[PDB]
Write a protein that binds this ligand. Structure first.
Ligand SMILES: CC[C@@H]1C(=O)N(C)c2cnc(-n3ccnc3-c3ccccc3)nc2N1C1CCCC1
Length: 285
């Protein structure tokens, strides 16, 4: 099937399905005018009848369409026709972290340092652009053919705000709610740092440091910021995770402080990682 951009030219071929992605059904989509393939969201209007979810996508696009970084999903184009809304994004053949970790359960440090360096780099970009991702989670870290990491799904993203006028309500439902955001103080840049801690944790142990149900039963526990630190962690990793998951946010480290932590400096880290690290654990040193 051929899909023409009625505002322009401009013809596209639609290929393989890629699965469900909330409102979007995903499909491979080829721009016939340059023959590159792209991962596309296709949201029919029927599913965006209601004004606030209509607004939810406008923002994702508005915020996404200005982002150019090697570790941020490269937004290509978007257009609409009578039936559907169309968003083409960087095609990431080797899926997400979420997929990888299910296979391998738990990762070796060199790779954790390999993947985190990339999550952290992409996030300086956004954070310096004054944009908060607000949903860092293994699912939203996309890997490509050449084993490179890009952060995507900017569906719960927002611009930084004056701390007095900021959104207090939990927007959407993140994977990792923070203490501050639970005391109704709103999502800060550090609330992203929070998520990174939980994420590193998961990568090293295959289970999150706190429940991810967003149930009120689980709220005191997060607010206290108390969790099991297992002995299986070397001290560098232990220490780093701890500072990242500080209870009060203004104690959490900066992104620069993070890539410069012992965990980073006194291990070894590959420039290139094989594709077999998707399924198999690597060789020593
Ligand atoms: C299009 C939405 C999302 C995405 O944003 N990108 C950039 C992406 C980029 N590349 C792929 N991609 C390409 C080949 N396989 C995938 C894929 C499939 C499942 C999960 C993640 C990626 N998928 C992407 N996805 C998937 C999320 C869930 C279903 C579609």
């Amino acid at each position: 099937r051929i899909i023409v951009d009625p505002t322009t030219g401009k013809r596209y071929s639609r290929g393989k399905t890629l699965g469900k992605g909330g409102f979007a059904k995903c499909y491979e989509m080829t721009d016939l005018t340059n023959n590159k393939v792209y991962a596309a969201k296709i949201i029919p209007h029927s599913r965006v009848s209601k004004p606030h979810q209509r607004e939810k996508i406008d923002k994702e696009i508005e915020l996404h369409r200005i982002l150019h970084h090697k570790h941020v999903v490269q937004f290509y184009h978007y257009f609409e026709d009578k039936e559907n809304i169309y968003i083409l994004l960087e095609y990431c053949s080797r899926r997400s972290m979420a997929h990888i970790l299910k296979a391998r359960k738990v990762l070796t440090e060199p790779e954790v340092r390999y993947y985190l360096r990339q999550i952290v780099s992409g996030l300086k970009y956004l954070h310096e652009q004054e944009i908060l991702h607000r949903d860092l989670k293994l699912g939203n870290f996309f890997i490509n053919e050449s084993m490179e990491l890009k952060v995507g799904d900017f569906g719960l993203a927002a611009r930084l705000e004056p701390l007095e006028h900021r959104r207090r309500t939990i927007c959407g439902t993140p994977n990792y709610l923070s203490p501050e955001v639970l005391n109704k103080q709103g999502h800060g840049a550090e609330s992203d740092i929070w998520a990174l801690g939980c994420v590193m944790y998961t990568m090293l142990l295959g289970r999150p440091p706190f429940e991810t149900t967003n149930l009120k039963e689980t709220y005191r526990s997060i607010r206290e910021a108390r969790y099991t630190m297992p002995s299986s962690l070397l001290a560098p990793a232990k220490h780093l995770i701890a500072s990242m998951l500080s209870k009060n946010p203004e104690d959490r480290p900066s992104l620069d402080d993070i890539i410069r932590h012992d965990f980073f400096t006194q291990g070894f880290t590959p420039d290139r990682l094989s594709s077999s690290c998707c399924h198999t654990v690597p060789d020593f040193h």
